[PDB]
Homo-oligomer: A and B are copies of this chain.
Amino acid sequence: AIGIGTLIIFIAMVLVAAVAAAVLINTSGFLQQKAMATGKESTEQVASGLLCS
């Protein structure tokens, strides 16, 4: 009798961990974009310019 239930709740544990992992993976992806963008943009700003002759 006991055995049956153990299996069922095990399934839930798996899925819930999976769902949480998805958040972390996805979020890391979302940040990767902006992280790079910010650095490149900021460098081009400080480095570039014109000078009156």
Contact = CB atoms under 8 A, between A and B. Distances in A.
Interface of A: 1, 3-4, 7-8, 10-11, 14-15, 17-18, 21-22, 24-25, 27-28, 31-32, 34-35, 38-39, 42, 45-46, 49
A31 B15 contact: no
Copies of this chain in its oligomeric complex: 2
Nearest to A29: B49
Contacts of A28: 3-4, 7
22 contacts: A4-B24, A4-B27, A4-B28, A4-B31, A7-B28, A7-B31, A7-B32, A8-B31, A11-B34, A11-B35, A11-B38, A14-B39, A14-B42, A15-B42, A17-B42, A18-B42, A18-B45, A18-B46, A21-B46, A22-B46, A25-B46, A25-B49
